[PDB]
Design a binder for this molecule. Sequence first.
Ligand code: CLA
Ligand code: CLA
Ligand code: CLA
Ligand code: CLA
Ligand SMILES: CC1=C(/C=C/C(C)=C/C=C/C(C)=C/C=C/C=C(C)/C=C/C=C(C)/C=C/C2=C(C)CCCC2(C)C)C(C)(C)CCC1
Lengths: 220, 742, 89, 73, 83, 162
Amino acid sequence: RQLWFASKQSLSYLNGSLPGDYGFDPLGLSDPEGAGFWFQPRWLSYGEVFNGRTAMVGVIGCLAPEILGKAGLIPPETALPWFKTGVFPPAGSYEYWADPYTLFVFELGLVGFAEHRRYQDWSNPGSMGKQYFLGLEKGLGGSGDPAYPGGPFFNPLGLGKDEKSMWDYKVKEVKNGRLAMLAMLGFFVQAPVTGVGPYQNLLDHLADPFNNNIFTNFKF
Amino acid sequence: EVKILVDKDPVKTSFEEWAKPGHFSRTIAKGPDTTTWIWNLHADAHDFDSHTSDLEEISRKVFSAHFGQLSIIFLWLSGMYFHGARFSNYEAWLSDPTHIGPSAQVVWPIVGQEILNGDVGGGFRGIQITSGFFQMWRASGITSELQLYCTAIGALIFAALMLFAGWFHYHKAAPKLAWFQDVESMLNHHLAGLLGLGSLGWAGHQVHVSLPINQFLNAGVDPKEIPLPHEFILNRDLLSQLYPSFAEGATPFFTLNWSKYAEFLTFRGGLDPVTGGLWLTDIAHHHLAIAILFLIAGHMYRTNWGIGHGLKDILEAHKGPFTGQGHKGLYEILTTSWHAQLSLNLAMLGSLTIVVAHHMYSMPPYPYLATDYGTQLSLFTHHMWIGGFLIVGAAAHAAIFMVRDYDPTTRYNDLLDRVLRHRDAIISHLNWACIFLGFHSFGLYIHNDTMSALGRPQDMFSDTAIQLQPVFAQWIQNTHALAPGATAPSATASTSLTWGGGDLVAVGGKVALLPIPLGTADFLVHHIHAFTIHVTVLILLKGVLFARSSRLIPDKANLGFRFPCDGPGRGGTCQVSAWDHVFLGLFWMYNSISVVIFHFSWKMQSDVWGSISDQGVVTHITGGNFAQSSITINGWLRDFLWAQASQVIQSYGSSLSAYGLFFLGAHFVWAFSLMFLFSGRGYWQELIESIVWAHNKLKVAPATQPRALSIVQGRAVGVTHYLLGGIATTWAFFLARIIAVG
Amino acid sequence: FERDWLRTDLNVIGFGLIGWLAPSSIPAINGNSLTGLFFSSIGPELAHFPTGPAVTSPFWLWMVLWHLGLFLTLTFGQIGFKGRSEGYF
Amino acid sequence: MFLISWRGYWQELIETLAWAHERTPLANLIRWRDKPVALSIVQARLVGLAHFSVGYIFTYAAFLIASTSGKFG
Amino acid sequence: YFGSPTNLIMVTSTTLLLFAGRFGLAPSANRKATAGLKLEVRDAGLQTGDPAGFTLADTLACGAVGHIIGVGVVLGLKSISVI
Amino acid sequence: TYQVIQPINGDPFIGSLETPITSSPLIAWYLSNLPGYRTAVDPLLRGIEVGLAHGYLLVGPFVITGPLRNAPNHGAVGSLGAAGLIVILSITLTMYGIASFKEGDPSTAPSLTLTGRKKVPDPLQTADGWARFTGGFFFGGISGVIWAYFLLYVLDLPYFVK
Ligand code: CLA
Ligand code: CLA
Ligand code: CLA
Ligand code: CLA
Ligand SMILES: CC1=C(/C=C/C(C)=C/C=C/C(C)=C/C=C/C=C(C)/C=C/C=C(C)/C=C/C2=C(C)CCCC2(C)C)C(C)(C)CCC1
């Protein structure tokens, strides 16, 4: 197996049993000895997969309005950089049907109902297929693996029937999650340095590459 | 290998042990039979190594106690910011800091106490504060009361966070002993992480929020029209007008053209004439350099990769023909004894606090701090007292380590062994030094007093008589005054105005700082200081060195660290424990610090502080009477104690009336302590025997049998009351004098 | 007690003296040297014998900065010579 | 001093001074004839009380005589 | 800026110190010095893929301290006005 | 390795240590050649030397720091004060000798060297020896005071501080 900056400590517990395993753990965060709460091997893999899943959607969320508005698809005023949509009021904001602080409460309620239910699966595997939830609990029983629930809702197409395809898909998903993680970190770093959006940054670089980079942008 | 090591749910969270007082110790948990129990519960509350012999269990307890202390400190800071935001005249003081006295406490109108709301100016009535918070807030760029409210809310949130962290790390995730003993990682993180990153962040705040707002303030623009701090980050153009170099961005930093940042990163020295404090451009550069120095320092030790040092390796390689094996064995001692680490850290912190006190008056960092005499005197005295107390605690805990954790069979060290093998020579030499210094310092004062009383002023030790000039300190002053020209060419002015550069800084018709002259009187007080410091060192070192055994008591270790005596035998064996030595050394620390603060007060009021007119004439508070009057004890009695106490004794019926009341109360408590210090418990137990009879006659005798205080407890009560009364007397007298006349 | 506790070498003195006098004589101070400055300041003070140097004289700083280095080199040379033969390094 | 500090501290300190005298050249030629010991427990109380009373009497006598003799009432 | 003496100094310092760490002329993760200098062989257990056992920690440390040396030389070559 | 500090005379249970301050050959020779440690010679001559040194050294402080230091008669007055101090010191020496030594008793000085070799104990620790020592001390001290006065204020030599 290909190893990227491994160690004796890393290879003791990183044995290839997890998808996207390259023995990379310089700081020993996944060591099973004396591990609990936030720093345990089973919470960290779930956190990696979950964070990659949100980052994968977030990259498209940031890139879609700016790309569509650079074409003639969506109205210009709805095509904004991700930091000018109201998420960062100093950089500008948009006027929606509801106040942003009222939208925050609605999102808080919905997302809380989702995430507390997600957590009770981790803290109690089969718990959420038992109590009445308007009949949806029939498909919210989990699978015993917190990051891979499956079922009628979360895996409706029923892909990865055999083990060899499920493992390959898990590898691809963790790899794309890592790549989108890096992409969103790049977005966050580029936003203050260069005052424009990621797509404008891309276009301005393949127009005159030697005058649009970090070396030039050590001025803002 | 260095890794996180925790234990899950070690102690269950329940109220059952709250209902059982004394649960932490075997003896106390059984309940009380006499009143002594009630005291024993409070004296052993935090003596964790006496509760259990497990090092891990003790370490977890101290780790959570630190979180509790941090929560209390955050609550205190939140209260200070909230009172600044809600009950203060800060916004009026900002527009006129030279004519308005800071105030952040307002009393209620009850039982006539509303007289304490005095005229501090700015259309405000309150109590004048001497903490210096107003100048620090002005330096930080704080301009409105809203930003203080947000700071109070944040400090409350942080206090809640620390309390939750303490509970979580004692009851849910308790770190193992190996985690605590990872000293290399702790040193690396505290040097690079805490200090380096903290100073870097503060430097960023200063170059982004402090420098521009203070430039606007020092230019004379209204605080309510200064742009908000974030406006100096949003449009960089506002920042490119005060300093055009900001137009270049971070390109000069990465291309190594640092002189392009000379506008806001300077090496000036001296004081800002408009402000009377250190240049903010100097302070930002200081913090930016300190950040780099500490970030590089925090990379010295080896944690998980090959690079770095081993502390044990460094210790074991330092030995010589006079010191045997050297420092070998010290790593084992300092990684298994909490008391030795506490002793070392207490000594270093107490020494650093005194340095802070000395440096803050000579180089006022905050704006309008030098001309606020009440704040300067209060800060100096406060930090001197804190340093002295921490230094005494260092000796106490070194003695505790010697009594309990010392073990030559398993934790031998050559240096400590060799020190214990010639302690007689050390103690006798320090005794001789103390006697010599006491004579040649205090007896000169007696000689001067007798010569003055005999009508022979020409036979005294004075500047107009037999001279004793501090030539070495004068040479150091002259050398530091010439530094900008030869030894610090890049510096524009000397590091302080007191070295002798022949300039004075005046702010609002008041003298900030000027060259401080040294003469015979200073020669006298400095040796007085040295004598008292040496006596305190003698008392504490004799207790530390002779704690385990002496020729009188071969087995003093079996008696413990804190015991009254070993009986009236051998002529009398009172106060032979190491605890008594701390009890005695507290008095001498008090004496030394009192003399130091008296010296500071008189010198500042006589030769530095004062007023300046629009002619060029300086008039000091006491008119330069220190040189000719501070050389006799009668001079201190008359021109300092009698003359300057005239304020606190005529403060009745004014806003300063609370200081005379505290003056009398402190005198009363100081006198009260002498009952405990001069007597013994055998008389008091016999006296209690008669009162118990009177109670039994009326069937009101309590089941908890009344006991006189223990021999050690009476000493503790006496010394605590003595120190409280003494320190409060000076607190009230100093504050009244410097608020009325300053 | 050993007769000669210092274990005198008499090569350490010369080696330390030369190893202080060689680098300190480099003209890196406005064209002058630390030894040069100290030696040139010695004479004018002797010009007004028996009165001692004034408080504001440059003699003291030069005297202290030269002897700190001399003592440092001598002590370090002695330590190195004695500890290389006893397995200290 | 006598009323606050007690005997054992002083005895343990006198032991060191005895050693120092016994080890000092040109002073070994002189020997004490009575062994130096600290003051007794009862002796120290009496000495401290005497100093306290003498200071108490002298301070007030000086103050009273001087205050009544500066102005003569 | 490229080809200027400051850039030349930074690159030469970084390359020299990386070469010194790589070729056993400076302390590294697998090479610790005794009291009298004298690098000794040490098994760090890092694993690097490099034939001479040059680990990522060694590269980072060498780069950082070479940057320190380069800044020290640059600031001081132009303070003297050689640059 | 090589340690410098050793137990006194090789005995680790005698309350002293051997240090360069106490046992170096230079200091040992210097202390052995002082008149206070010359065991095999008449104590009178040793006292003469001791008094000659001490009375001579005592002249300066009395002459220069005394109350009459600024008077033209300062030298004689200071010399008289130094002579009075020498007289008081001789009185103290006589008192100590009378209190410490009986006429018939032998010497209290040690009779062994550091090498364990028997020697004659110092006769200075006897009544007659101490009496001779204090008489020599008085005679030497008065003569030293007189000599210092003669050098300073009878020949008036150009001493920097007078
Ligand atoms: C070290 C921190 C500190 C300190 C010393 C103070 C000190 C003070 N604050 Mg303050 N404060 C702080 C932090 C601090 N605060 C913080 C963090 C906040 C933000 C929440 C505030 C918010 C605040 C406000 C809003 C006010 C004060 C006020 C005051 C002053 C009067 C307080 C008083 O009378 O208590 C009130 C009395 C009590 C709280 C009672 C004590 C409770 C204990 C537990 C005993 C309970 C017995 C009870 C009273 C008996 C009845 C019980 C019932 C069952 C019968 C006083 C100078 C007041 C002031 O200055 O007025 C001009 C005021 O209005 N503070
Ligand atoms: C860069 C990393 C870092 C930082 C910043 C700190 C900072 C601190 N440590 Mg610490 N520590 C570290 C790494 C670090 N440590 C490591 C790696 C170890 C193991 C070797 C330890 C072991 C250790 C012990 C055993 C103790 C401390 C203590 C302290 C506090 C000293 C009191 C003080 O100066 O108040 C400064 C106060 C502030 C700066 C206020 C802000 C508080 C900070 C920001 C919180 C620190 C968060 C922490 C680094 C990570 C949080 C974990 C995360 C899951 C939330 C201080 C908050 C002492 C203490 O008081 O314990 C509570 C103590 O007893 N530390
Ligand atoms: C961070 C510093 C620090 C820490 C962690 C400790 C920790 C400890 N010390 Mg220690 N100490 C310190 C500083 C410190 N000390 C300093 C600075 C001194 C010098 C004064 C001492 C002097 C000292 C002695 C002499 C002794 C200890 C002891 C102890 C141990 C038991 C403590 C206990 O149960 O107290 C319980 C707490 C109390 C009984 C509360 C006392 C309340 C005080 C006296 C009142 C203070 C006045 C107050 C400020 C004004 C209030 C006014 C009023 C009207 C409200 C414990 C390990 C004892 C021990 O046996 O160690 C093993 C012991 O004998 N320490
Ligand atoms: C003002 C009161 C006072 C005075 C003068 C002293 C004096 C002394 N204390 Mg002290 N002490 C006091 C109160 C006082 N104490 C109190 C209240 C406490 C309780 C906390 C203590 C607790 C204490 C401890 C715990 C220790 C001392 C020590 C010392 C000695 C320090 C050495 C020294 O300075 O010798 C010089 C002598 C003096 C300064 C005394 C004044 C002499 C002047 C010059 C006049 C002399 C003229 C001449 C001789 C008169 C002769 C005339 C003839 C007719 C007799 C010294 C004897 C320490 C000690 O013994 O170390 C050696 C020590 O360890 N004391
Ligand atoms: C040969 C070869 C190769 C190459 C290699 C190399 C060449 C590498 C390099 C690498 C590198 C090249 C690295 C670097 C690094 C660097 C760093 C890491 C830096 C850092 C810096 C810093 C940290 C800074 C700091 C500071 C500041 C910020 C301020 C000023 C001062 C100081 C300096 C302190 C390969 C493998 C491809 C392939 C095979 C062959």
